[PDB]
Amino acid sequence: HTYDYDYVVIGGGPGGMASAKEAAAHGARVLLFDYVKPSSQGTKWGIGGTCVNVGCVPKKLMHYAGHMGSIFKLDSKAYGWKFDNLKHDWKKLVTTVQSHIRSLNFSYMTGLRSSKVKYINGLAKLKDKNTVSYYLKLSKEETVTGKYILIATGCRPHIPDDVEGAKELSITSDDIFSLKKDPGKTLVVGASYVALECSGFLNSLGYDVTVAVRSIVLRGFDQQCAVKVKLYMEEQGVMFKNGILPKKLTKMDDKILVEFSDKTSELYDTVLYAIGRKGDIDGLNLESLNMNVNKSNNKIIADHLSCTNIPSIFAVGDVAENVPELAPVAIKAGEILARRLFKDSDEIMDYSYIPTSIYTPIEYGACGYSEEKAYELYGKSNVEVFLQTCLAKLVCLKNEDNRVIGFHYVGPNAGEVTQGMALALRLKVKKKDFDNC
Amino acid sequence: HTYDYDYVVIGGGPGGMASAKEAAAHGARVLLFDYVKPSSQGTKWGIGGTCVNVGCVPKKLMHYAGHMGSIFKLDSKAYGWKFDNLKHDWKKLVTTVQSHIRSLNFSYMTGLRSSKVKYINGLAKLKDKNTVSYYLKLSKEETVTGKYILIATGCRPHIPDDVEGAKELSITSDDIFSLKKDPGKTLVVGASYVALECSGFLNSLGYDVTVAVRSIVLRGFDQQCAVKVKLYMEEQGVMFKNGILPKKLTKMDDKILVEFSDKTSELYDTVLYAIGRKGDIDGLNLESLNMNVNKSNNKIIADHLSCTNIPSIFAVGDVAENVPELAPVAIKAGEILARRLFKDSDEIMDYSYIPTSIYTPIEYGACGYSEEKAYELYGKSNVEVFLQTCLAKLVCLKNEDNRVIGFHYVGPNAGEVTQGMALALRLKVKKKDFDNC
Ligand SMILES: Cc1cc2nc3c(=O)[nH]c(=O)nc-3n(C[C@H](O)[C@H](O)[C@H](O)COP(=O)(O)OP(=O)(O)OC[C@H]3O[C@@H](n4cnc5c(N)ncnc54)[C@H](O)[C@@H]3O)c2cc1C
Ligand SMILES: Cc1cc2nc3c(=O)[nH]c(=O)nc-3n(C[C@H](O)[C@H](O)[C@H](O)COP(=O)(O)OP(=O)(O)OC[C@H]3O[C@@H](n4cnc5c(N)ncnc54)[C@H](O)[C@@H]3O)c2cc1C
Numbered sequence A, B: 001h002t003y004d005y006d007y008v009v010i011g012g013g014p015g016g017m018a019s020a021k022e023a024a025a026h027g028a029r030v031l032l033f034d035y036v037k038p039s040s041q042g043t044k045w046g047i048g049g050t051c052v053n054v055g056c057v058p059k060k061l062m063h064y065a066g067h068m069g070s071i072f073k074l075d076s077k078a079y080g081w082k083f084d085n086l087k088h089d090w091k092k093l094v095t096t097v098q099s100h101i102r103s104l105n106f107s108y109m110t111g112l113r114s115s116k117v118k119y120i121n122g123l124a125k126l127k128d129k130n131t132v133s134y135y136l137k138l139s140k141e142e143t144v145t146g147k148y149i150l151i152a153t154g155c156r157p158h159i160p161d162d163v164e165g166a167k168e169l170s171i172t173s174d175d176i177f178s179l180k181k182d183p184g185k186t187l188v189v190g191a192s193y194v195a196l197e198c199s200g201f202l203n204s205l206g207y208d209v210t211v212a213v214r215s216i217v218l219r220g221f222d223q224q225c226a227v228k229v230k231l232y233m234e235e236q237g238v239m240f241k242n243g244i245l246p247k248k249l250t251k252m253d254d255k256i257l258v259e260f261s262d263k264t265s266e267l268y269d270t271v272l273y274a275i276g277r278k279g280d281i282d283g284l285n286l287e288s289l290n291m292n293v294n295k296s297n298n299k300i301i302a303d304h305l306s307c308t309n310i311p312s313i314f315a316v317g318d319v320a321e322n323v324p325e326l327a328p329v330a331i332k333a334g335e336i337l338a339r340r341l342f343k344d345s346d347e348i349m350d351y352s353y354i355p356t357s358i359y360t361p362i363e364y365g366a367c368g369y370s371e372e373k374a375y376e377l378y379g380k381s382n383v384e385v386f387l388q389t390c391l392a393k394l395v396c397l398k399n400e401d402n403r404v405i406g407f408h409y410v411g412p413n414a415g416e417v418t419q420g421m422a423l424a425l426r427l428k429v430k431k432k433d434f435d436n437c
Helices: A014-026 A049-054 A056-074 A090-115 A193-205 A223-235 A327-342 A371-378 A414-426 A431-435 B014-024 B049-054 B056-074 B090-114 B193-205 B223-235 B327-342 B371-378 B414-426 B431-436
Strands: A005-010 A030-033 A081-088 A118-120 A122-128 A131-136 A141-151 A155-157 A186-189 A209-213 A239-242 A246-251 A256-260 A265-268 A270-273 A277-279 A313-315 A356-358 A364-368 A383-387 A393-397 A404-409 B005-010 B030-033 B081-088 B118-120 B122-128 B131-136 B141-151 B155-157 B186-189 B209-213 B239-242 B246-252 B255-260 B265-268 B270-273 B277-279 B313-315 B356-358 B364-368 B383-387 B392-397 B404-410
Touching (some): A014 A049, A014 A327, A056 A090, A081 A090, A122 A141, A141 A327, A193 A223, A193 A356, A223 A371, A356 A414, A393 A431, A404 A414, A431 B414, B005 B014, B014 B049, B049 B090, B056 B193, B141 B327, B186 B193, B193 B209, B223 B364, B223 B371, B223 B404, B255 B270, B364 B414, B371 B383
Parallel strands (some): A005 A030, A030 A118, A141 A313, A186 A270, B005 B030, B141 B313, B186 B209
Antiparallel strands (some): A122 A131, A246 A256, A383 A393, B131 B141, B246 B255
């Protein structure tokens, strides 16, 4: 009618993509934007967003490389295997990782045209409630109109501005997976699942890794398991600086001089910041429409309907506040919105009992409620916990037939196990059913 | 005062163990026998039964050894890991395996007395409805009386008697996990999940294996997958002799000349039989009490309640007919019987939806009815199938909301995936649930 496109998505990640290929799968004409702003270290990559280029894919691949070395050094010789001169080539791992990422970048290209979604390689910005201005990447504007707009820009790794040298001298998850030079003696700053996973496979590869955590590691997860992971990581050679953080970074002849709140200065080889990520919003001119944005984390504020502060606009994925930063949790929410918008669907997003799996030296799969968080919502009185690397932790409700609220496992292949249990939780499994299984 | 014991258990395997302890855990005077008759190659072992000494445990340890290699060969180098002079010491592996097996041997021993279950290391024989005779291990016979008697003697590998030289020249699973000398060029006769697993890890270790099958592999599971597993094993270097079996085995300078039905005669270093296992009942004197036994496999015929024709005697584990040969399936079955007997329990053993995992080169975990099993039971119009190393087979009912009845996954970690999804099936999952997951 009087709109260039019915569906104008901003961001080519799993979410934005997942929704586009869905809106076009129901007739609607969809225009999709995706442009990778270079990292703080000038690193760039192809179409696919975070998960593919600097997330799940490269992360898991790296992990595997680290797990091999771990298997060789711990078990290999005990199981009758004999080998000589065991060494690891960093550049070989990267070339393999980056090679695979590129074969996906192309695999996703030939995917858009197949779904017939007009893809433009340019960074977009909000011109008007129904209009989207953009720059094709030289900068000359080009405007477009759409019946509905989706914001799926996700987030980008956060680096502190108050810390002198941090921004310029350190790297992030954005750079590590395509890093040319050897990581060398590495300092990892943060306690996220990313921070521990990175310092996790770096240590397994045989690097001098050191993690600086302000307070706790894996905040948001069950802390009885979090502590077991940290202890294990410490036994494997990962050293933690508890309560100490970098105050300033200085260059010293191809080495980084890090000064901690400790007043202690230990010069490292590579500094990696993984203190969290904040939504990529600053370039979307949102103040011009007074959108509901969370200042703390820079995310769009979205109701479960996925509707924004403005009726015309929507938000899905890592940009939405309180929405778990997972590839799958982002794909579905995008699928549903497409049906809500173009198939007159009545289904709404389900954010409960989604399983996450941290790929640390010792894996930690989690689905449902933490123990402590289950106490806040239901109280110790009404919450019962059971144990049942063969450790498993089941958190269930006292008052309603010990129905399982949460499930946590710190063991080999936790990712695999937790995924199955996740479906059992949705079917409202109960301890009764477990012991009798 | 009537009998010497309240409970007399013949068999020290998983089933016998689990039961005796559960019986003693509720106030019953329990006597338990266990005596490992030497293999056809004179191989003997400590207390714990099959799973521990010549089953699950060792099998899994061996597989893991082979798996390492497979990682070295296939993936190691691609991930930046370099090394020299890769070799495998068979002896080192057995000493590691056997060491662990012995650590368990002692664990269980100290466990029984810890649960106060009078244990005799003698092989038993039925004297009458509630009297058991046994011989210490010259001979003397000691009788003992019991209110309830349980037989849990499991099975032992089968070697054909019609084939000349087989019994004397060839080996079985009883032998391999403690084999002094190298297996060398190995011929594995049979297609059982044991048959494939063994030839699998032997192959992964780097031996010249050869599997002679009658017709099909893994009869009883979903053939669609059984074909995948065979194909993959072939690509990995396993040679299958289809529809060709040995008709005679001859000795020759430390090698064995195997003459096949093919009219072809080739020579191997080691010939392993895994064509199936038959219940160890022959020496129980059961035919004295006209027991109901399945003639083809020498198994006791069991009640849903684990009852024989003789109400004073019960049967559990692997000796019972149509009872799946899994360590867990024998424990739960042996623990219910105990409660049933000594704690007036009204509970019955459920056999449906029990998960198995085949540790072949490519793992294949299964749970629920097979595709052919489903059809014959429910009908093709009634049943629909859905397919997801990333592919899973779902066999669900058309008529009742596509409730899953069979889950088959051939992948990296089938065991884990199958285990989890197993519980889901018991909760009566639907394809509708899976799609939503
Ligand atoms: C190291 C790491 C490991 C992870 N591992 C896992 C895992 O194992 N499993 C899991 O489920 N999740 C994992 N995640 C999280 C997962 O990657 C994200 O939650 C998922 O990618 C969400 O995608 P999204 O569409 O919401 O945002 P994104 O995937 O980040 O997509 C946003 C895209 O839009 C583009 N863009 C941004 N701004 C603009 C603009 N204004 N104009 C045009 N284009 C723009 C960006 O280039 C970006 O590529 C991991 C994350 C990280 C960092
Ligand atoms: C190679 C192999 C691999 C396997 N892997 C797995 C697996 O991975 N997972 C799984 O769940 N299951 C596995 N199984 C099956 C599992 O081992 C059995 O199903 C389980 O051990 C059942 O034990 P049971 O107590 O019923 O009998 P058994 O374990 O065989 O116990 C019977 C015991 O009684 C003793 N006995 C026999 N006669 C007498 C006598 N008259 N007097 C005194 N004692 C006697 C025998 O010496 C024997 O030790 C495997 C089996 C094999 C052969």
